[PDB]
Design a protein around this ligand. Structure first.
Ligand SMILES: Nc1ncnc2c1ncn2[C@@H]1O[C@H](COP(=O)(O)OP(=O)(O)OP(=O)(O)O)[C@@H](O)[C@H]1O
Lengths: 237, 92
């Protein structure tokens, strides 16, 4: 599985998702920076937080930004690529490189309603909250999950991570345009309208498509027309 | 009952060089990968089955697995193409 010592991704790299990201920080960032306070008042922080929503909406992005802001190790697992030994080994490493944010992608692929599943429940009952290992899970179908995962002391904190709304889309386009010279007359709002029902991944792929055309034209920056051809290009996929 | 799929020459070789390609090569590659996926998708249309008898299932199982590997590669292509692209405008 993929391990990143300390990912260099700030909250500044996440377009929109303000309410959710704050919910996440209340659930993970807070008990990490000040675990004693949760002991003083005497309440356990959530061991696991489930991020459900469509793909390319920034579930991974959120989990990496937390791991960044909290100076932790980021260890990611792909749920389909697990399809039990490896789960134990995982959490073992996770404890070893603490602080650690474990990100279980495609958790539904192993947690529908077997050996590997049971292991994950064990590992999470294992380590205790206030501890410096926290779990974040990502899925499409929270409906399809086995109710053992959502029971307290596991993934007992749920956060919807939906598609970018008209405005969130503007940010995401700009976000991937930052390291990239851009004309001052560029209409970011018109772009947000033409990218109806787009996701973060696709919106990033627009900026990649735009900067290509500008380069192909030997422009010194990316013009608004480039982006629209980019959106045009991206639409066909 | 497909036989009309276009085939990707030197693809698995070019795919493995994404991190070491220049931008122009990535552009040609991206276009080629997409051309391959268009052919795969035409087929997923003919069965009328989206990406989500017994010799049916096996092909569809493989068809899907192929697209996903292609999508995972094209994704990598763009993440790298993006970084190289960002280096161009910081260069300036
Ligand atoms: N809100 C966002 N702001 C900026 N970029 C985004 C956002 N959401 C997604 N992206 C871009 O989309 C790509 C995929 O993002 P990410 O993997 O975080 O989404 P995800 O929901 O975790 O996808 P998956 O379903 O594969 O887990 C990333 O390269 C990221 O740059």
């Amino acid at each position: 599985f993929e391990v990143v010592e300390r990912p260099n991704v700030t909250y500044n790299d996440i377009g929109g998702l303000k309410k959710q990201l704050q919910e996440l920080r209340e659930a993970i960032e807070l008990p990490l920076k000040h675990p004693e306070l949760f002991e003083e008042v005497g309440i356990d922080p959530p061991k696991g937080v489930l991020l459900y929503g469509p793909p390319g909406c920034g579930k991974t992005l959120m989990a990496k930004a937390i791991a960044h802001e909290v100076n932790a190790t980021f260890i990611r697992v792909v749920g389909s690529e697990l399809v039990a030994r490896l789960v134990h080994e995982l959490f073992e490493l996770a404890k070893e490189k603490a602080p650690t944010i474990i990100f279980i992608d495609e958790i539904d692929a192993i947690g529908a309603k077997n050996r590997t599943l049971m292991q994950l429940l064990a590992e999470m009952d294992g380590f205790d909250p206030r501890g410096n290992v926290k779990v974040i899970a990502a899925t499409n179908r929270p409906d399809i999950l086995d109710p053992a995962l959502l029971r307290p002391g596991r993934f007992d904190r749920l956060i919807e991570v939906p598609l970018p709304d008209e405005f969130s889309r503007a940010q995401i386009l700009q976000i991937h345009s930052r390291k990239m010279t851009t004309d001052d007359d560029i209409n970011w709002q018109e772009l947000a309208r033409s990218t109806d029902e787009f996701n973060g991944a696709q919106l990033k792929a627009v900026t990649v498509e735009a900067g290509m055309i500008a380069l192909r034209n030997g422009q010194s920056s990316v013009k608004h027309e480039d982006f629209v051809e980019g959106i045009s290009e991206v639409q066909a996929r | 009952l497909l036989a009309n799929v276009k085939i990707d020459p030197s693809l698995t070789s070019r795919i493995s060089q994404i991190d070491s390609f220049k931008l122009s090569e990535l552009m040609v590659l991206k276009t080629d990968i997409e051309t391959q996926l268009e052919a795969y998708f035409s087929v997923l249309e003919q069965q009328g089955i989206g990406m989500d008898s017994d010799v049916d299932v096996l092909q569809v199982t493989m068809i899907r697995k192929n697209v996903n590997m292609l999508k995972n590669d094209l994704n990598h292509l763009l993440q790298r193409s993006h970084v190289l692209l960002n280096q161009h405008f910081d260069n300036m």
